[PDB]
Amino acid sequence: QREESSIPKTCVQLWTVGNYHWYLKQSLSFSTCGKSKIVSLMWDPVTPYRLHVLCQGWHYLAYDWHWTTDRSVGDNSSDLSNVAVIDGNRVLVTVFRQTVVPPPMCTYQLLFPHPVNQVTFLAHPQKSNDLAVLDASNQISVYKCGDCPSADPTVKLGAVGGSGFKVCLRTPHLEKRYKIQFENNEDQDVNPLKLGLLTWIEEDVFLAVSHSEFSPRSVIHHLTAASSEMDEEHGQLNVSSSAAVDGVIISLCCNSKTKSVVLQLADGQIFKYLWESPSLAIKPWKNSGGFPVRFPYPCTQTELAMI
């Protein structure tokens, strides 16, 4: 607090290492004065990816992470094998159907004004090359592929560029910068990570999962884009729905061809969620024998296939 009127901030950063290159993977923001001040931090001595935080106003938090890879799946004639990696305020994209680039380098590179927290791909069979990015300031940016790159200044070339080198590929361009508005204006929570498991299920529909703090309950949100007309740039994502579930949701999966959405609870029960229906009902997942399905143990990676 060098400035007299400056409001100090607290940040907790999670870093890892690669080929002797130090990445910046996660960033959490906390206040510094009042009930929100942090007193102590501690890593769990047994479980590798659990973090314990104790604040001042008799407040306790626990965070759980796991490793994952972000890839695109689509039709053979259209999809290019894509992989996105987070490096702080930049996102590195490698197109594996055309170039095979060692991990520290990349095919192209996207630059952002704030550190990035989540990266996801579209779930359309013929448009599986689009990208969505959510950063630490709670705004969602959308990058789409078109015939004309439009030469936006936020896209750079990696190892496929230089003086005299030329390779034919289609780079994306920025299209919107959405802003998320919640129910009225509130202090939210000392917890800075309220939207998790972000999933882009349609060119204007996102799904997110929020956790409660009194009962072991979870909420599924519907983020939809609303605009009166093409007034200007930027936009507004209005929460248009909310579904309540008993239990802790730990994974959400979707199928781009059959359009089915699957939820996993903390004990192992698998549920099917219908979003296009007017009832928004939730049902158990049935096997061939007509019985409900339960994983014997909590799985960390889930997928839906057609055997």
Q: Considering only 143-151, 185-193, 222-230, 278-286, which stretch makes contact with other proteins by CB under 8 A?
A: 185-193
Q: Considering only 42-50, 143-151, 226-234, 253-261, which stretch makes contact with other proteins by CB under 8 A?
A: 42-50
- 85 binds other proteins, rule: CB under 8 A: yes
Which residue from 31, 36, 38, 63 is in contact with other proteins, where contact means CB under 8 A?
A: 63
Which residue from 133, 25, 164, 154 is spatially nearest to 88, judged by alpha carbons?
25
Instruction: Work out the number of other CB atoms within 10 angstroms of the CB of residue 102.
Output: 9
- 226 binds other proteins, rule: CB under 8 A: no
Q: Which residue has the tokens 């049902």?
A: 283
Q: How far is the CB of 27 from other proteins (least distance, A)?
A: 11
- 152 binds other proteins, rule: CB under 8 A: no
Q: How far is the CB of 134 from other proteins (least distance, A)?
A: 12
Q: Considering only 5-13, 14-22, 172-180, 219-227, which stretch makes contact with other proteins by CB under 8 A?
A: 14-22
Is 207 in contact with 275 (CB distance < 8 Å)?
Answer: yes
- 192 binds other proteins, rule: CB under 8 A: no
| Gap between the Cα atoms of 42 and 61, Å rounded | 11
Q: How far is the CB of 185 from other proteins (least distance, A)?
A: 21
Burial level of 221, CB count in 10 A (0-12/13-18/19+)? Answer: buried
If binding means CB under 8 A, how many residues of this protein chain bind other proteins? 62
- 14 binds other proteins, rule: CB under 8 A: yes
| Gap between the Cα atoms of 29 and 14, Å rounded | 12
Which residue from 27, 141, 251, 256 is in contact with other proteins, where contact means CB under 8 A?
A: 251
- 297 binds other proteins, rule: CB under 8 A: no
Which residue from 176, 109, 99, 172 is spatially nearest to 140, judged by alpha carbons?
176
Q: Considering only 72-80, 147-155, 188-196, 227-235, which stretch makes contact with other proteins by CB under 8 A?
A: 188-196
Q: How far is the CB of 208 from other proteins (least distance, A)?
A: 12
Token digits of residue 7 = 């409001």
Q: Is 53 left (phi over 0), alpha (psi -120 to 50) or beta?
A: beta
| Gap between the Cα atoms of 33 and 295, Å rounded | 44
The residues, ordered by sequence, that sit 6+ positions from 202 with a Cβ below 8 Å of its Cβ are: 123, 124
Which residue from 25, 90, 124, 272 is in contact with other proteins, where contact means CB under 8 A?
A: 25
Whose Cβ is closer to other proteins: residue 7's or residue 168's?
168
